[PDB]
C-alpha cells in the first residue's frame, strides 16, 4: 500500500432493502469473490511478506 499510488474504495448499500418471506427469519449472507480482468499486468518480481522462518526445517 502506497498513497500516491492508491486505488479508491468499494462500498455497498441497500438500494431498497432485503425482504424475507413469511415463516423465515434472521440474517442472510452474501459470499464475495475477487479475480483479475484479462487487462491485468503485474511486474518486477520480489519476495512475499507472507512467509518467513527462523530455523531450517528438517525431516
Amino acid at each position: 500500500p502506497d498513497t500516491y499510488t492508491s486505488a479508491g474504495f468499494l462500498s455497498c448499500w441497500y438500494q431498497t432493502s432485503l425482504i424475507l418471506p413469511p415463516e423465515t427469519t434472521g440474517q442472510v449472507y452474501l459470499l464475495s469473490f475477487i479475480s483479475a480482468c484479462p487487462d491485468f499486468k503485474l511486474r518486477l518480481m520480489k519476495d512475499t511478506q507472507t512467509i518467513s522462518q527462523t530455523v531450517a526445517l528438517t525431516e
Binding site: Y14, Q15, T16, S17, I19, L20, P21, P22
Partner: protein, 255 residues
C-alpha cells in the same frame, strides 16, 4: 433466453440491472436526441458534458405504507443538486435534456399492492386555495425530496388531493400519459425513457420544469401476516443527451 423481464441499462459510469422488469416505455415512441440545427435559434455552440452528466443519480428513498397517497418529483428540479449535472444547470442560461427514469420496489410473492408510475409533460399544479391563488416557486421546486401528496396543505403550496392529479383532472385518466404499473405480483421496477418535450428548442432549467414524475399507490400495499407493514420505493434517474448553452455567472434562485 432474453426475457422482457431482465434488463441492463449502462449510462456513463453507472449500470442498473433488473431481473423483474415489464418492458420499458419510451414516451410518445421517441428516444432522446440532441437539438438539430434546423430547429436551433440561439447562436451559441452548446456544451455536451456527456458521461459526466449522463449517468444515473439515485434520489433518496420513500416509504410506502398503507396510508401513502403518492409522491411527485419535477424535472430537472429533482436533479438540481446532483454532481456536475446540477452545476451546469445553475451556470448556463439555457439547457435541454431527456432522461431514463427507473422506479424500484421489490416485495415477496405474498405481498400485494400496485403503484402507477407516470410522466406528465407540463404538469401545471393547482393552488388548494381556489380562485386565482398562485403556487409559489419554492413549492413547485421541492428538489430531490419531491412533493408528498399525503403531507398537509401549506400556504402558497399546491393542492395534494390524489383523485385530482393536483390539477382538476381524474386519477383514472392519467393513463393517457406515458406510464407503467409496478404490481408486486408481476413487476418490481418501472422504466420510462423521456425525450425532451417543449414548445421552444431549449429553455431555462430553473424557471420551468418540463415533466413531473409521479408514483401513486393505487391498489394499497398489503403485507403478509405479521410482516412489517411497509416497503421502500427508490427512484434513480439519468439525464440523457444533455446540452447546456449560454454560460455565465451562475443563477441565484429563491430560497
Amino acid at each position: 433466453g432474453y426475457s422482457d423481464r431482465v434488463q441492463q441499462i449502462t449510462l456513463g459510469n453507472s449500470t442498473i440491472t433488473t431481473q423483474e422488469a415489464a418492458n420499458a416505455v419510451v414516451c410518445y415512441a421517441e428516444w432522446p436526441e440532441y437539438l438539430p440545427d434546423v430547429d436551433a435559434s440561439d447562436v451559441n455552440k452548446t456544451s455536451k458534458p456527456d458521461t459526466s452528466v449522463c449517468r444515473f443519480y439515485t434520489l433518496d428513498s420513500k416509504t410506502w405504507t398503507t396510508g401513502s397517497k403518492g409522491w411527485c418529483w419535477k424535472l430537472p428540479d429533482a436533479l438540481k443538486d446532483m454532481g456536475v449535472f446540477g452545476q451546469n444547470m445553475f451556470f448556463h442560461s439555457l439547457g435541454r435534456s431527456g432522461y431514463t427514469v427507473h422506479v424500484q420496489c421489490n416485495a415477496t410473492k405474498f405481498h400485494s399492492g400496485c403503484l402507477l408510475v407516470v410522466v406528465i409533460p407540463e404538469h401545471q399544479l393547482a393552488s388548494h386555495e381556489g380562485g386565482n391563488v398562485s403556487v409559489k416557486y419554492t413549492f413547485t421546486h421541492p428538489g430531490e425530496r419531491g412533493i408528498d401528496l399525503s403531507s398537509a396543505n401549506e400556504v402558497g403550496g399546491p393542492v395534494k388531493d390524489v383523485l385530482y392529479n393536483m390539477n382538476g383532472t381524474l386519477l383514472g385518466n392519467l393513463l393517457i400519459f406515458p406510464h407503467q404499473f409496478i404490481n408486486l405480483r408481476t413487476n418490481n421496477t418501472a422504466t420510462i425513457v423521456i425525450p425532451y418535450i417543449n414548445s421552444v428548442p431549449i429553455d431555462s432549467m430553473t424557471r420551468h420544469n418540463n415533466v413531473s414524475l409521479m408514483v401513486i399507490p393505487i391498489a394499497p400495499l398489503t403485507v403478509p401476516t405479521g410482516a412489517t407493514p411497509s416497503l421502500p420505493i427508490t427512484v434513480t434517474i439519468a439525464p440523457m443527451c444533455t446540452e447546456f448553452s449560454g454560460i455565465r455567472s451562475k443563477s441565484i434562485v429563491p430560497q
